[PDB]
Amino acid sequence: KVFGRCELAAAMKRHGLDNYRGYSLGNWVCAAKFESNFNTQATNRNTDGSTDYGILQINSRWWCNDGRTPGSRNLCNIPCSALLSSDITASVNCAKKIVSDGNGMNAWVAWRNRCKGTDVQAWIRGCRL
């Protein structure tokens, strides 16, 4: 599923991401835009053989099991394929663990390089929240 901007914002707010660990909603929408272009089916291979999955491009090296990243962890205790669902519950729940691990949203390279320090509130402007 390819979300609309305000559709995704509403879904993330319902699942408790607004101001989660101090990150306002616009941060999460900005991150999803540049990680996946709001596409729940996005996948990208990393040079170490791990793969990033879903709307927030969560990495199989640490966070999910895809059966083909030897020596990796599964800290969210999910198959990586669950992160590609049109329902973003699994992605949000796993993102909550990632952002809680000490590095904040710096875990998402696109957030650090394209959202951090910008007017992220613009990503939820015009949305009925």
Residue-by-residue DSSP string for 62-107: TS-B-S-STT---TT-SBGGGGGSSS-HHHHHHHHHHHTTTTGGGG
Output the CA–CA distances (angstroms, integers) from residue 29 to 5, 48, 63, 68, 75, in the order listed: 7, 27, 20, 29, 23
CB of 91 to Cl ion, least distance (A): 19
By C-beta, is 86 or 118 nearer to Cl ion?
A: 118
Annotated active-site residue 52? The verdict is: yes
104: partner contacted, choices Na ion, Cl ion, none (Cβ within 5-8 A by kind): Cl ion
SS3 26: helix
Question: Which of 18, 52, 66, 119 does the annotation list as catalytic?
Answer: 52
- Dist CA 23 CA 95 (whole Å): 12
Helix (H) or strand (E) holding 59: strand 58-59
* 121 interacts with Cl ion by CB under 5 A: yes
Residue 65 CB, nearest distance to Na ion (Å)? 5
The pattern of x and - marking residues 49 through 78 that bind Cl ion according to CB under 5 A reads --------------------x---------
54 interface partner picked from Na ion, Cl ion, none, CB below 5 to 8 A per type: none
Helix (H, G, I), strand (E, B) or coil at 51: strand
Q: Pick from 15, 26, 91, 95: which binds Cl ion (CB under 5 A)?
A: 26
7 is catalytic: no
Residue in 36, 51, 57, 60 binding Na ion, rule: CB under 5 A: 60
Instruction: Report the catalytic residues.
Output: 35, 52
